[PDB]
């Protein structure tokens, strides 16, 4: 009484409503530090003028 396990399972059945169906989520967090930027886009480099 008043002493519960903090976690609980998801009920994932194929017949579940889309609201209750499982969804995989990846969150990308971008950030700048006291270092050169090491994650860059595919954007091609060019000669310097």
């Amino acid at each position: 009484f008043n002493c519960y396990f903090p976690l609980q399972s998801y009920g994932f059945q194929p017949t579940n409503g889309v609201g209750y169906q499982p969804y995989r989520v990846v969150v990308l967090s971008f950030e700048l530090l006291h270092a050169p930027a090491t994650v860059c886009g595919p954007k091609k480099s060019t000669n310097l003028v």
């Epitope: 002493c3 519960y4 396990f5 903090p6 976690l7 609980q8 399972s9």
Partner: nanobody
Framework: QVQLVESGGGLMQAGGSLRLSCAVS????????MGWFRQAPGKEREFVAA????????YYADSVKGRFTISRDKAKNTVYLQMNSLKYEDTAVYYC????????????????????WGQGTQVTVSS
């Protein structure tokens, strides 16, 4: 997949004691909680006691509370039911049960459908 094998049932006089074991085999890393249920001839199945595999916390029905102790051995993959002060009402077939399901409220395990069942072991309480 898991299989459950009860043992340690039989005859005993009212006011005496008995110890049921149930051995889990198969995918045992999947056990969330275990339960004991009983069913006298001609009456419906009834929840007895549940234990959470991690933490070893126990929930009991009111009819057995203070007389029965549920306990587990993680290492030996076995749940125990220590039945003391046996009574008329205790006579029944006892089933152990396993669920892969984590419920926050331990009480849930009284009413929640379990995943696998043993064949059962008979208990009988003499007059």
């Amino acid at each position: 997949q898991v299989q459950l094998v009860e043992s340690g049932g039989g005859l005993m006089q009212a006011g005496g004691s008995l110890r049921l074991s149930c051995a889990v085999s198969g995918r045992t890393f999947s056990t969330a909680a275990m339960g004991w249920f009983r069913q006298a001839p001609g009456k419906e199945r009834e929840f007895v006691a549940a234990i959470r595999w991690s933490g070893g916390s126990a929930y009991y029905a009111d009819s057995v509370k203070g007389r029965f102790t549920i306990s587990r051995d993680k290492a030996k993959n076995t749940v125990y039911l220590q039945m003391n002060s046996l009574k008329y009402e205790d006579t029944a077939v006892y089933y152990c049960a396993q669920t892969r399901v984590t419920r926050s409220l331990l009480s849930d395990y009284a009413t929640w459908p379990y995943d696998y069942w043993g064949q059962g072991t008979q208990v009988t309480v003499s007059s």
